[PDB]
Enzyme design. Structure first.
Site, mmCIF file in Angstrom:
data_model
loop_
_atom_site.group_PDB
_atom_site.id
_atom_site.type_symbol
_atom_site.label_atom_id
_atom_site.label_comp_id
_atom_site.label_asym_id
_atom_site.label_seq_id
_atom_site.Cartn_x
_atom_site.Cartn_y
_atom_site.Cartn_z
ATOM 1 C CG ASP A 109 9.246 38.937 12.588
ATOM 2 O OD1 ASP A 109 8.538 39.563 12.400
ATOM 3 O OD2 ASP A 109 10.110 39.065 13.737
ATOM 4 C CD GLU A 110 7.755 33.659 9.680
ATOM 5 O OE1 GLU A 110 8.221 34.202 10.737
ATOM 6 O OE2 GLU A 110 6.496 33.873 9.667
ATOM 7 C CE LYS B 248 1.909 42.352 14.905
ATOM 8 N NZ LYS B 248 2.357 42.043 16.356
ATOM 9 C CE1 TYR C 171 -0.760 40.925 16.160
ATOM 10 C CE2 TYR C 171 -0.899 41.605 18.971
ATOM 11 C CZ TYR C 171 -0.586 40.885 17.823
ATOM 12 O OH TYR C 171 0.667 39.805 17.709
ATOM 13 N N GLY D 63 3.185 40.908 9.734
ATOM 14 C CA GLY D 63 3.540 40.355 11.142
ATOM 15 C C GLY D 63 4.312 39.164 11.179
ATOM 16 C CB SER E 215 9.041 38.846 18.273
ATOM 17 O OG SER E 215 9.113 37.641 17.155
ATOM 18 C CB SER F 249 2.209 38.348 21.344
ATOM 19 O OG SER F 249 0.762 38.525 20.967
ATOM 20 C CB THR F 250 7.293 39.810 21.097
ATOM 21 O OG1 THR F 250 6.547 39.522 19.903
ATOM 22 C CG2 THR F 250 8.544 39.601 21.343
ATOM 23 C CB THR G 220 -0.019 38.328 12.778
ATOM 24 O OG1 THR G 220 0.359 39.857 13.131
ATOM 25 C CG2 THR G 220 1.012 37.692 13.067
#
Lengths: 290, 290, 290, 290
Positions: free
Chosen positions: D189-190, D163, D135, D187, D206, D46-47, D165
């Protein structure tokens, strides 16, 4: 007593401190009967801020309503609650007071399965000698029942109908067709016309407290198939409803009643007190639609 | 009173008729203290079937809990309700009872804006001389508040923390960092490990009524950074929770308590009565984890 | 060219390996024109399994439909896509082929704000000498646009209308009243009656591939204000749609066509191959409604 | 090849018109390898704005990435698509190019049932001699799979991982425990810290395109169980991510790369072009964190 017709979800008058204002409530009731000319009142619904009240307050409101109305118009008491015991007590109370029928919102907050929802409804209706109308309002409770589920509830002949407050006209059409012998009430005032052509046996709304006449026109013009005329009324009605929702639904309908000399009063906190902007806006709305 | 620690969302015992079995309730309380070794009790929450009860019942429960516990462990009283008047009433009642802090769920059913939610919370805590904790749990209420909205709430120094019953670890992380001076309690038992590493100040959960020991191990081990060990406990804890969920959350925890001589009893209708299958199943779960 | 009327969201015939079955496609086209008597075809929509195809496959379908139709009925080309460049390429291709109008679903997958969506539509319509119709469909894209947002989009006089595939009859009613000069098409076959009394200028549906006649009746009967008869056709129509939906929408409509000699074929994988049960049921459905 | 590690969801450089800027793309790759020190590149996600591109552009990006990376780091190729045929095509293409593994998002837009999703994944991976990573990302797809469904997918030995997310750490914990032999990639990051303590075998993000060093620190610190330190880095990382999201995710990441001489370029329309404000804000963010 045949329940078909237009019903105002009865608003209740509160003072700035939140105390019930019996004089105001009685005026609201009188206005609905003499000015809005509705066929009956729907007492204890979302519109009446029912769920922000104590059980004793609920009983007081049911008493006042039955006393002021007497036998003029019809009466439906909404007695649903997350507390089944309270719902059963209120069904007996209002059945004793002479209410023509009772209604119960689907139990909420907790996530009950259908089996439990059915048990809930049967326990309510099986405890009193009355008739029950299923209150289905998905956008607030979050509960959505299928067609077959409604079929199971309808197994009981004392469960005579349902108040359909959902935008699912496919389900509504299926209901009308599958349950010809059951009452179906439209729950969205701004969608009265499309609901009526699907055969609803009436409507129960919060805006009827001040827009009752137009409401009846839409419902009647439609039943007489004057669609283009009905759509025009629905248009003005929706212009009115749009400003109301925009200016705070409950505060505004009450402020519109005030303009007519009715002491509709305040809404229970935490429902905000009408601001100056709101009051001035409510005045404009009255000038534009009344 | 420093409120950090492991709290059990206190379950209530009901008889076959659905009425409170006080002896059973005291035993549940004693089990939590003597066996689960919890630091405190969260009384009046969802787990206690609170919203299906009348105000008098809520009061009785608040008194029983305080009388049985006395000073042994900390107590938080959840007094939230859609009826702000009841909320204020219970806030005083419990404060007068010596509860170490109060908690209030976000007003539900009707759709309140932030201004109103903020008014609701200010009214509650400002009516008594206590401290309040925000009960967020959006999967039942549907109310999701932003970081800044929490900031506005935490503008009242009597609002000391929040029970985070959401799965947003991003927001969770933001709040720990943004309000290091406020308490943050994890609300999802199955996600205890991942929330503890973000620095929550404790946990409030339903499964603690029986799995309090493992809960403390997860919490303590994690705080001591023995992650690989905390995870294994979380794994076993999650196997237990998965089975409890599949068999009926509230009914199973109570049956697991009955197995130990704790008269946890039945659940308040319309929540279904345990079936033979569920009871037999609960016994299998007991032998596998206890 | 006046675009009002009944349009079938064209289905495409594929063989078992996923290849476009041209012979079958032309038969589907002929059936809609000669038997269903629709006013036009909506090509490249969800019903045509458009997003499971390549750009050149989409192009072949647009040319085939154009060729087979000749100039017998109207044609609308759905050219929307997550890839704006493909949308522009397809808009030019179909405009050059002589399509009466183009349509474009709101860009999905990625979360675009309104400003970006506006750039999307303007980019498409400004690239060709044609007129565009907004394809909303909120349940497959999750995009909800307010009345004011639609107002902006309509600023461009080349954006002549919208395909309303949402159940919000309130928004529908406001759309009609606010944009009396724009075309509004209903996208929900099972709610044609309630949508028509609100003033839609026609309908675009997947079930019209086989039920185009009844669909036209519901539309005309309603327009002539013969509600009772309109409702009856809607009832039988919804009996059909209910069965179709329960058996597998796309596969079942195609099987219903096969029963009539139209080689509608398979759906593109991963959409499942009709099972023996689905085929047996499909036959029953055909016998019951045709 | 062992696929564990930190992977950057590779960003793609585009010129003002939307054309792939091959030079800038190679600089993004070199930066990720030389400056961010990542273990590998997740290409076509997606990124990478993958879904707004044509098949030929996707292939071109795959070619460039493989040519520029050579054999330095690992390469995973996301080949999923609503067009099964395209996904298969890309699976063969990337496999032939020597990609270490492939990945496929769940088929979206249409509402496929599980049987069909299983078919989709089997068709893709059974078509090549490679390994596949599921995914999930239900945030943009709306597809929520259960533990048992992931079980059937993992029936295939060639489907080596997933993955993850989503914010469901419960499901994550169950996954780790239930499929000890499978690869699980974080998935979000934060939320790297809370997810890593649950045992994920690595991460795909990303923001790694510019924050790979910190990302590795969180991951490795957490793996070493140095939680307090890991949390500190997650706190700064989340300050970064928060500013980024606030200023526009994709635009800002590219602008941050620009400040470092990496011609990240524009985003594909209809994603908006960076405003002056956005650009200055990006410089601040750059100074504040790099």
């Amino acid at each position: 007593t045949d329940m078909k017709g237009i019903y105002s979800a009865l608003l209740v008058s509160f003072d700035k401190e939140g105390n019930i204002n019996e004089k105001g409530l009685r005026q609201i009731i009188r206005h609905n009967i003499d000015v809005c000319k509705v066929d009956g009142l729907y007492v204890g619904g979302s519109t009446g801020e029912n769920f922000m009240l104590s059980t004793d307050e609920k009983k007081r409101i049911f008493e006042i309503a039955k006393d002021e109305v007497k036998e003029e118009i019809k009466l439906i008491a909404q007695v649903g609650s997350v507390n089944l015991k309270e719902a059963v007590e209120l069904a007996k109370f209002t059945t004793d007071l002479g209410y023509d029928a009772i209604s119960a919102v689907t139990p909420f907050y907790y996530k009950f399965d259908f089996e439990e929802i059915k048990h809930y409804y049967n326990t309510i209706i099986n405890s009193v000698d009355n008739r029950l109308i299923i209150y289905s309002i998905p956008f607030l409770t979050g509960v959505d029942m299928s067609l077959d589920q409604f079929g199971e509830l309808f197994e009981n002949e004392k469960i005579i109908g349902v108040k359909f407050t959902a935008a699912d006209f496919y389900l509504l059409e299926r209901m009308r067709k599958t349950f010809p012998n059951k009452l179906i009430f439209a729950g969205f005032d701004e969608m009265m016309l499309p609901a009526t052509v699907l055969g609803v046996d009436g409507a129960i709304g919060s805006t009827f407290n001040v827009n009752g006449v137009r409401a009846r026109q839409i419902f009647e013009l439609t039943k007489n198939e004057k669609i283009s005329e009905a759509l025009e009324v629905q248009h003005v009605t929706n212009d009115l409803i749009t400003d109301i929702l925009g200016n705070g639904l409950y505060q505004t309908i009450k402020l519109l009643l005030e303009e007519q000399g009715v002491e509709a009063g305040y809404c229970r906190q935490p429902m905000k007190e009408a601001t100056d902007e709101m009051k001035s806006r409510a005045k404009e709305i009255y000038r534009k639609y009344f």
